[PDB]
Amino acid sequence: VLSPADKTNVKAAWGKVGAHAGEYGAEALERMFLSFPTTKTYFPHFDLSHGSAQVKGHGKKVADALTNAVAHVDDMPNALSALSDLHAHKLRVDPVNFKLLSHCLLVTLAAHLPAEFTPAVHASLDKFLASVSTVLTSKY
Amino acid sequence: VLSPADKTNVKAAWGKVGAHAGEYGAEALERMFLSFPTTKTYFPHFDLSHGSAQVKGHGKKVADALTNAVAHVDDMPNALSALSDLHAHKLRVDPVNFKLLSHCLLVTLAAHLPAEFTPAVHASLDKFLASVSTVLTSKY
Amino acid sequence: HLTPEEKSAVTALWGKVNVDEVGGEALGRLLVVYPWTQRFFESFGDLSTPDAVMGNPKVKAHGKKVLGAFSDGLAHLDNLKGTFATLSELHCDKLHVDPENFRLLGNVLVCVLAHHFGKEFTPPVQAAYQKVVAGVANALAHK
Amino acid sequence: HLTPEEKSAVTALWGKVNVDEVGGEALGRLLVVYPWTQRFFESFGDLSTPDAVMGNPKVKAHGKKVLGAFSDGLAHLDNLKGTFATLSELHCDKLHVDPENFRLLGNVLVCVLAHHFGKEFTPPVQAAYQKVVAGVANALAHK
Ligand code: HEM
Ligand code: HEM
Ligand code: HEM
Ligand code: HEM
């Protein structure tokens, strides 16, 4: 459960992503695939080499989904319902993989926005990503 | 996130507990303390012997809380705010311990209510207990 | 590992286990309670409802193999690592099963034993089984 | 289990690490991001705001010791299981630190390295460090 302070922290930090949406999304995916090779098993249909067109395109979709989550932070189950059906019902993604991607997202943000990535904001981002993760792994 | 089916299963099953709630709470605690002895460190002030009235008394309180959670299953962060403050802010309970108690509650229910502990009900009780646990380990 | 009285209690209940059903019920319950695990069992066919899962003959037969592996654990308590070496290799290299799931299955087996044995599955008997299932999980995760 | 290319990448980055700061930063973030971990360090006094934590001298001092142990591992990658042999006995027996927390600290350290190094903390560099921190966390959990 996110605090009011968590919600404002996430808004200000994620808002700084802006035009860098696809870029940071693609980088987080690349970090996940290289750091945690078993996650590649969900993408056998992808070219997963550095700079791949498919990973770029997908990174943008992931990052835009999180942007949509931030915009609907108080109504995430409703806003992410189709994405929950995709991940939980169709893809059956092991919840461990959300932890790995969420970690790689935090790493990406820290590498890129060191001013934003204070300990308090790190904490709020981690809670935010865990909540998005719970939504996408549940079916309700 | 709980499905509509999840809420109805939990209501039905926890309803079967009734007068035994206190009793089941105490046994789950006892199961937890014996199977996972590191959890005892949160209770240095308790008599933790088998049959302990202190454990019995606390089991009733845990059970009563779950009943209240069921009653406000759509409103749990609000309904459980006092307990969140206690467990997350004051006691700083490691979230691992909630998984242990939840498991021990499921074991107790299986041992006592075998006709009611169907696979479907087991799944819904698990997701419900996970949700209560998240609320109690959250600072919001 | 286990105290002698833990061993005799554990062994006494294990000898009474419904060998045809218990493993199947644990695997079945894992698939129902933790549905992402169904990803690993696409070759089993229909797993789309709890009834379908629990009655599926591949679930029942594989469950019996899983139970035999736990039994082999109980037969080899001072050498779980060696017993499960080949199985650990399989689950890691070929199957790509995250190890947290080994702990989930072990705990589901405990729930099924409680379900089948009722008040005979006492807190101390549970405590001993928890040691067994954690040992099997650790051993499977070793590689 | 690190390759020579991974060992070279890890070693090169670690040479540039501020040894008096990074450990305190990682421990401080652990206590802020995962506030239950504060339970183990009540002797530190005020840990009640992110600012109180991050500026606590006991956090800074203990984190230096923590960092020093990672540096040990980094100079002995092929034998982390003996490099951390004593420390493992401490956290399990006396301190009762649940193992999930070792992995959390390792990942918080990764976050700190990314924060400090920015674009230099490349995806392959991270991958190598993930092996290091998993190695350390495994080695520490051994008892
Ligand atoms: C922050 C967590 C995540 C978010 C926000 C997210 C978001 C998305 C989005 C927006 C899509 C595209 C759906 C569409 O185009 O209609 C998608 C597809 C997908 N996601 Fe995720 N996802 C997350 C985590 C994961 C994880 C952890 C995995 C597995 C490692 C995963 C595997 C996939 C796969 C396999 C697809 C289908 C890709 C394709 O065929 O094009 N996702 N995800
Ligand atoms: C769903 C799980 C849980 C529920 C519903 C629950 C509920 C409660 C309730 C109702 C109280 C009494 C608060 C009051 O007087 O108003 C309480 C106190 C407490 N709980 Fe929990 N709790 C849960 C899990 C845990 C776990 C996992 C631990 C640690 C292993 C824990 C440790 C405590 C402690 C130490 C107290 C204070 C006891 C005392 O001083 O009397 N709880 N809990
Ligand atoms: C933790 C206790 C577990 C034990 C004792 C166990 C035991 C076994 C055994 C004995 C086999 C048969 C190997 C063979 O045919 O040679 C096997 C295969 C398998 N296990 Fe497990 N396992 C466990 C956990 C898991 C989990 C958690 C999953 C996934 C959720 C899993 C997925 C599989 C799969 C996919 C196979 C291959 C089945 C096939 O298609 O033939 N196992 N396991
Ligand atoms: C996983 C990486 C970790 C490493 C390398 C590590 C290393 C160390 C070292 C070297 C010491 C001895 C410091 C000294 O007194 O000279 C120590 C002590 C300690 N560690 Fe850790 N540790 C780790 C994780 C954790 C975690 C996750 C916790 C709990 C949240 C924890 C709690 C403690 C405590 C309570 C002490 C005793 C410190 C004192 O009061 O003097 N450690 N650790």
Side-chain angles (χ1 to χ4, degrees), chain B residues 14 63-73 76 79-80 83 128:
Chain B
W14 195 252
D64 280 23
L66 294 174
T67 303
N68 191 50
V70 172
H72 309 263
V73 71
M76 294 194 297
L80 298 179
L83 300 170
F128 171 70

Side-chain angles (χ1 to χ4, degrees), chain A residues 94, chain C residues 27 30-31 36-38 40-41 43-44 62 65-70 84 87 90-91 95 97-106 133 136-137 140:
Chain A
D94 188 317
Chain C
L27 174 64
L30 183 85
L31 303 164
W36 65 90
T37 59
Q38 300 174 30
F40 298 93
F41 300 94
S43 73
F44 282 22
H62 188 60
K65 297 284 192 179
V66 171
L67 199 71
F70 280 95
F84 293 98
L87 275 179
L90 182 74
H91 288 80
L95 270 21
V97 180
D98 190 83
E100 177 71 30
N101 299 301
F102 306 149
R103 291 189 286 278
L104 293 182
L105 183 54
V133 300
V136 172
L140 265 185

Side-chain angles (χ1 to χ4, degrees), chain C residues 22-133:
Chain C
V22 162
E25 289 170 29
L27 174 64
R29 279 173 192 269
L30 183 85
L31 303 164
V32 170
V33 178
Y34 310 108
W36 65 90
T37 59
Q38 300 174 30
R39 174 161 173 275
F40 298 93
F41 300 94
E42 276 146 352
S43 73
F44 282 22
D46 190 10
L47 300 173
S48 69
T49 67
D51 285 357
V53 172
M54 304 310 292
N56 176 310
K58 303 301 181 199
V59 167
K60 291 200 179 194
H62 188 60
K64 199 182 298 197
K65 297 284 192 179
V66 171
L67 199 71
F70 280 95
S71 201
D72 200 17
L74 281 163
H76 291 94
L77 282 178
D78 303 326
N79 197 196
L80 295 176
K81 284 188 185 188
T83 305
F84 293 98
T86 304
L87 275 179
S88 183
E89 265 189 26
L90 182 74
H91 288 80
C92 172
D93 308 349
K94 307 287 178 164
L95 270 21
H96 302 283
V97 180
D98 190 83
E100 177 71 30
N101 299 301
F102 306 149
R103 291 189 286 278
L104 293 182
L105 183 54
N107 279 352
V108 169
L109 171 65
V110 173
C111 289
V112 172
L113 295 171
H115 197 206
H116 282 241
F117 286 104
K119 78 171 178 193
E120 214 179 327
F121 197 74
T122 65
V125 167
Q126 176 182 355
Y129 271 97
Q130 295 294 163
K131 284 173 189 173
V132 177
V133 300

Side-chain angles (χ1 to χ4, degrees), chain C residues 6-23:
Chain C
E6 279 184 318
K7 274 166 192 164
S8 73
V10 168
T11 292
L13 287 200
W14 194 250
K16 283 174 171 176
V17 160
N18 180 338
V19 309
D20 290 324
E21 297 306 321
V22 162

Side-chain angles (χ1 to χ4, degrees), chain B residues 29 32-33 38-40 42-46 54 58 61-66 80 82-83 86-87 91 93-102 105 129 132-133 136:
Chain B
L29 287 171
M32 182 185 69
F33 295 139
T38 57
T39 64
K40 295 196 275 176
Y42 290 94
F43 294 86
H45 57 297
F46 271 38
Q54 203 157 8
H58 189 66
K61 293 204 159 94
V62 183
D64 280 23
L66 294 174
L80 298 179
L83 300 170
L86 175 62
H87 295 83
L91 295 161
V93 184
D94 190 318
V96 72
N97 297 120
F98 280 84
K99 294 179 202 276
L100 301 180
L101 181 60
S102 296
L105 252 359
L129 291 168
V132 172
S133 296
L136 297 206

